[PDB]
Amino acid sequence: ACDYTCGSNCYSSSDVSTAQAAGYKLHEDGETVGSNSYPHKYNNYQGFDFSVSSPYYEWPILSSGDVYSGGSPGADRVVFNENNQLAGVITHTGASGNNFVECT
Ligand SMILES: Nc1nc2c(ncn2[C@@H]2O[C@H](CO)[C@@H](O)[C@H]2OP(=O)(O)O)c(=O)[nH]1
């Protein structure tokens, strides 16, 4: 079973934890990877119900289970706050434009 389902991508809690950990570290270090500079600020304009406070940052989560290292980021993202607290898992999959939908 999947703790999170992004379109057809299935993620366990461990996948989310590993991704979050990597993204948070880069954040503390003042570093980014990839052409789109991850991790980067995330603005909740769609008003998802995050129970944790902003600011928020987005970091890619790979279907493969590998930690994002530059390269195609896919459509899935882990969202974390300034305090390394999980906000949610979202995806561009099935959303138009630059928008998102939450992973179920
Ligand atoms: N890789 C990727 N980027 C997308 C997609 N939809 C919108 N984007 C946005 O397009 C740019 C990449 O070319 C980024 O600003 C990225 O936003 P995020 O970084 O918030 O995902 C998508 O399906 N895939």
Ligand SMILES: [Ca+2]
């Ligand atoms: Ca996995």
